[PDB]
């Protein structure tokens, strides 16, 4: 008796800790698998949706705050300064997202806000004077429910996960704690990015682009907006001539200087992630002797919800923050009088979110074998790994060689003795890394007798710059040979793989090298292309992300002639009359870092080819199916894809 | 310019106080008035509608617990017996009448019930390991929507307030605390009244008829229902009469009741028994004045609560109807009556209590409904009343039992004013020391207005009560007409060329009756009025017993109907000249609206200036509890009555 | 297996016969027995309703001409006076009743009105010009839906058919064809009654009352209305002072002259309805010589929808009008220079609508044998008589003296010769007649094993002016004496009918009369009393005619105190101690003629003598139950009436 798919249905998912402002307590987020309507289910169609609500410990195990029975549930929470209340958003219904302020002390939530569109992004001011937050107010666009066209003017109009673009952007929105008034503070004409209050409450620090085009381009500048004086606000005055990508904003204590993550201008978007210092309009790199990049880039499937990463100031000259490093993620300190150093940093294992201040420490952490938990201060305060259904394995580690040094990657076995199936998978981005984090997916396909091969290659993010740069400009060269060197050795080192059983999958980025492999070798006996690229051309053309992301990759213009040809010449499509591999093709209509057109070329050419070939189309779902799509579609991904490996092995 | 009814919106209406089980907190519900939904309203129709939330005060201001912004709101506020978890009642949309748990010590409220049709009156166990309510479930009733009949067998089949009667009644359940768990404990046959835990937790006493026969009849006993095992009530009191306010004693074996023992009727005032092994005795003996509140006002929505608590092995708390006012009092197992808390100018209308604290709810005639705890204010209700608040004067008169008493609130200024006759129903209640918006609108507005308590009112003892028995529209209407002579003649101010007569259910009945026995007044309405007594016994939901009660007389027999039609003021009609205004709802099961209609035809037939306004949906409590717009349309109508003919 | 009330189903209802002006065709009405959605039927609860499609014949076997699917269908045809079009109203869902118009020699129809409301009474100009009707167009009262109170100052407020009657009356509206164009022609203060073109269509007759008094006190004048010619429309003109009542307006073919049907102003409204010549302001009795009143005043329960009976000049000197006479109704022809004659009396039979020209008629015909069919110019164009499902029985007369002469009745038997109950069935009215309608209520009683004995007593009216006289002010006396005789005679009789298994059962005065009985004898083993009065000072208040009802029958006015004694005993409730028999009730919640708290009365006073009582309340149907309420509702009233026979025999 094997397990399936469904056995996801048994999980709930944490996100969003946010320690206490005396550090001695963690609200969070909880999800949980429900009905859409446990009083009317549909006897036909089950509906597993997800459900959240507010979690609350102080050193002990977590307790509910919230009881949501209907509507997506509760997200959100922030801590008043004072410790005595929780801001947070809710989801039911009509009631797309207000903000609540519930007394932690005694009795119930208020609904703080009436906007027909809901509220996204509270945050208070550290005096508790204030809550900032960001809305579109009741503003209604009907064009779509009556059939009017839409006008495109703008460079960028769609975006995966809001689909469309709104033709005015969400407005930053005050909320007076003492005075219970709520006033608009400034409506961006592009759009604000990331926003965090200067420490004495006077105003915040935002992230926006000058117009679309530069916005297309990923050039942003740091603005100061103080609080409004009189009927018209004041306008935000430009702080940062930073031209380049930039979020998380963390001012300093002394409220003059600020740190931010992004990457200085010149640099383009496989350039790491990094901390620099500013003041006065002048930057310099804080992160130094630290050639990794901030955040958590490490792959897995247990994430729902938000995960927070800002960097938080522990003292005048320690910044905290987190990086990801060969297949993990640990948190660091960078300091302004000298290097970084480890915090809280295991080599096996991931801390996908945390907050803290000068009196705690809040975090989410998961390993490969540890499904993610809760900890405050050090201390676990969920139970969520019992929860999951069926053992989980142990990988074994596999490494290959390369000019540049050593790679790795890891074998996930079934149990027993017996030969079986081998299961190249290749991770997107393509600068992220695949290790420590929980995947699902690799347990359930281990635990149904396959063995998981998968490798960070040249390209992937955690093994320093270089090692990132060496696919610049021509991808399916030395990154598909680090694929294919890989799982050889792989089959080399354990004898049990069946070289004669093998397949090849993989999502984003993974799904192009997927393309490209099997229009490259035959060896594979199955193929599974998941939210693929087939024709860079027509993704420069279609992606929410094409009017840049090939110019930063490849150093290639679609729009130019001599660059295009290279772009096709490097497009799995120009190839595909080599696949004979039978391929199952994944892809949501709403994806938009991936257009479905994508998939209906690679499929239409193995039609015309006679190659077996089987196309599935997810209606409403985006690029993030696989890690938070809706619970049903995916099951049925997951299905699909064990119907094909069974079929063909 | 003078406020207008819209100044109802303003308040907000306090109900149901319930103290800590340490008495050193209350918990009480607030309905404030908003439109049916702030996201959505309707440009063209305004719809104010009641919104309820819970409230808590431990000595200070109170503070709101819940928030409900849509539906009716929260309700029924039960304190677990270790203080804390609060219990409510929840209705919000489609969701009809929740049991919800609240902790009080953080966090928001659990969702214990999950039935079609809600529940209601939730009490704790004393140990805390139960909850008992009362449901029909989910059970489906489609006779209505699909257009069938419906087929009656039962003497009795609606009753005001609600609508139809179900063909099976509420069944009692039983919610486990510590397993979390809902069981079914009683399903009964006719239905359950009171109901009062044994102070062990061992089971509780109900208040049943043995079948519909009896219970249209009013008469009642008393069983014991043991927690179920593998369960059967079983009668302890012979009473077959009306009984509600179980209190059991402390010792777990006695317990005291409210009602009267069979015999002379329900005219008889309602006092306190103790019942031992099936014997009943008086507990509040020397006290010649009925247990409860019967006395006037509109400013209260929501339970009122006034069940009696033991404060210890020998004394049992109490409120009773005093001329007007109602104060607590003190029963003793070893002695007579003593008062607690009795202004005799106040009336106190609900109240809980223990060992350890008392919570109360008190007003008067210029002073607003406010929540008290152990002698604390805790509200600031009085605060939002929109315009000042005047002083009534009182005003006397003689009869054959001694001195009769009414008021006279006037307005602003020393000039010559109208005078209106405002006359209770019941007829066994009291005018006096309630606070009535109405009439404080009515003196903002340029009118004097006289009301007053005729033979026949509760609070004079039983002898005042008696002496209008069978014989409706006699010394009642004397004593009515005698103290408006009074009044004219005591208060200057009052215009004896601009006088209207006006009141409600029996109010109803006697402004019918003095319009056909005398043309004195100028303008007269009649609000949910009685003016065939006859078809009142067969269409009203007590029509089966009230006559029979009240006056002796049983519709059914001839020789009595021919004396309800010489009490029915429609008899008399020929001789109404007086411009009428006649105020009623359509499902008005107490009064039916068969009975405006027949004074309608017949002003008409005479051409008598008459004007009808027909509600709909609401009923008999129209002016006490009924939908905002439709209490303010109401008093908008009145006003123009009384502007058109002065 | 007897047969049940279901048998209802299988039958069509016919209404409405047009005769085409030429006079060789025929238009008319059925209604069938549908399910509310054919399509999606409730799996759990049946629901039969009425639809109604056209029918036309030209001497054979009529042919549809509409097919009705949903709603209520088509009604009044309407032919244009050139022959080649039919107007009609049609009812589909949110279509209430719009003016259709009907090529007959090919195509469908075209609508030609669009009012929210609908309209009412078709009427085309005799020149074909115009076609007039009745609508309240598009005006909307919400206070039921939005639950404000209704303010009422008129006398009347409700009406039987109508519920309750809106603040302003239809207005009369003008479709001038050649323009195909809408006009509002006369919006009247208090309301239209019957209405007729001037033969050279130069405008309209209508009936009038002077205000809503005289209204209540059936008090009518006629009005003279000409064709519009400014945007104002002129006004009516006061043509006849009448100050009584009046309809059927039948305008004479010299354009001056016309007969109505009412009674002059003395007479109160037992008297016959008869036909008045109008010339100038003067009036003279013109159906002389005939002590019957003019119409169908004959029991049955087979007649859905409109039954025309409007006078007809067939010449210059002749009226073609129908009259009842001794439970029949025939066609009979008034003449200005002499008496009246018989042209179309079977005296066993009944004639309850017609339409006529001076070149051909057509008319609905049945007996008590002989479901009713349609005729044109003498012969049979129907066959709805075959549809009835189960064989018909002959009744057999028994007669019984009164002091005015002998009165008579009928005896419907079953098969076989053993004992059977028997059923004393009392009509309404009380001036109306049993006899020789249509009864399927009878012939299903006696399928189902009862002797169905019903009389014509004093107080009917197919005998003459005295003998309606005769009950004058004293209900309950010799009406009473002439039932219990007749039944009495029936027992002598015939000798099957079992004296020891009795039952008296009546609708409306029959419902009186039952209840009354019940209050003097213990003789009858059950009773069924249906719409019944118990109350006669209560109904004075509560009845749509209230205010004149016990005026004309009675000489009694509620409203005056001596009157309402009387009234008193005259009401069965004063004698309600009396009873002992088994009474089912039957009641219906919008009945505005007998009101429900007549029923409520009788149903708690028998409760409070522990009398055994059952009480049907039916929601939504009015007086009219019986005869034509909704299909399942007619059903479970004969279910109820069978059901406490078989309980009690």
């Not at 709403?590 to 196309?615: G, N």
Request: hydrophobic share 35%.
């Amino acid at each position: 008796p094997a397990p399936g798919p469904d056995s996801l249905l048994a999980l709930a998912f944490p996100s969003d800790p946010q320690v206490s402002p005396d550090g001695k307590q963690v609200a969070f987020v909880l999800a949980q698998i429900s009905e859409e309507d446990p009083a009317k289910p549909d006897k036909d169609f089950a509906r597993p949706r997800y459900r959240s609500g507010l979690w609350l410990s102080e050193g002990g195990a977590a307790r509910p705050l919230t009881h949501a029975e209907t509507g997506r549930g509760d997200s959100a929470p922030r801590w008043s300064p004072d410790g005595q209340n929780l801001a947070f958003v809710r989801s039911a219904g009509e009631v797309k997202a207000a903000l609540m302020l519930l007394p932690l002390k005694g009795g119930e939530a208020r609904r703080v806000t009436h906007f027909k569109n809901g509220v996204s992004g509270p945050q208070w001011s550290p005096d508790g004077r204030f809550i900032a937050f960001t809305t579109t107010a009741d503003t209604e666009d009907k064009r779509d429910e009556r059939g009017e066209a839409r006008v495109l003017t703008r460079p960028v109009y769609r975006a995966n996960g809001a689909d469309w673009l709104p033709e005015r952007p969400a407005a930053l929105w005050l909320y007076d704690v003492e005075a219970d008034k709520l006033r608009e503070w400034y409506a961006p004409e592009i759009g604000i990015g990331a926003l965090s209050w200067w420490p004495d409450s006077r105003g915040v620090l935002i992230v926006q682009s000058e117009d679309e085009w530069q916005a297309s381009q990923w050039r942003q500048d740091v603005y100061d907006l103080p609080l409004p004086t009189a009927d018209a606000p004041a306008a935000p005055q430009k702080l940062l001539d930073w031209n380049s990508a930039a979020h998380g904003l963390a001012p300093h204590p002394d409220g003059q200087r600020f740190a931010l993550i992004g990457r200085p201008a010149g640099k383009g978007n496989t350039e790491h992630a990094h901390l620099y210092l500013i003041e006065n309009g002048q930057h310099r790199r804080l992160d130094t002797g630290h050639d990794h990049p901030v955040g958590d880039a490490v792959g897995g499937d247990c994430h729902v919800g938000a995960f927070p990463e800002g960097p938080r100031w522990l003292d005048g000259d320690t910044l905290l923050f987190s990086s990801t490093v060969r297949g993990s993620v640990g948190l660091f300190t960078a300091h302004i009088g000298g290097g970084v150093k480890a915090y809280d940093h295991d080599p096996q294992g991931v801390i996908s979110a945390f907050t803290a201040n000068e009196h705690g420490v809040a975090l989410i952490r998961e390993s490969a074998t540890r499904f993610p938990e809760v900890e405050l201060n050090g201390q676990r305060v969920t139970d969520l790994h019992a929860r999951f259904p069926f053992p989980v394995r142990e990988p074994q580690r596999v490494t290959f060689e390369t000019e540049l040094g050593e790679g790795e990657g890891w074998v996930l076995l079934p149990e027993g003795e017996q030969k079986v199936p081998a299961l190249l998978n290749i991770h997107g981005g393509p600068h992220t890394d695949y290790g420590h984090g929980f995947t699902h997916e690799f347990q359930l396909m281990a635990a149904r007798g396959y063995g998981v091969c998968y490798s960070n290659p040249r390209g992937s993010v955690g093994y320093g710059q270089a090692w990132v740069d060496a696919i610049y400009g021509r991808w399916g060269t030395v990154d598909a040979d680090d694929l294919l060197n890989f799982f050889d050795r792989c089959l080399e080192a354990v004898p049990r793989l069946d070289a004669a059983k093998t397949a090849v999958m993989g999502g984003s980025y993974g799904g192009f090298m997927t393309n490209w492999i099997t229009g490259h070798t035959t060896r594979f006996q199955a193929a599974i292309t998941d939210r693929c690229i087939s024709n860079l051309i027509s993704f420069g053309g279609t992606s929410d992300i094409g009017l840049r992301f090939w110019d930063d990759e490849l150093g290639l213009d679609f729009s130019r002639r001599a660059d295009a040809l290279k772009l096709w010449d490097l497009s799995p499509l120009q190839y595909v009359e080599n696949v004979k591999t039978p391929t199952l093709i994944v892809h949501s209509v709403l994806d938009h870092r991936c257009p479905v057109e994508q998939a209906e070329q690679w499929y239409a050419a193995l039609h015309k080819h006679q190659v077996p070939v089987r196309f599935v189309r997810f209606p409403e779902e985006n690029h993030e199916l696989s890690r938070s799509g809706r619970p049903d579609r995916r099951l049925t991904r997951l299905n699909e894809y064990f119907a094909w490996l069974e079929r063909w092995l």
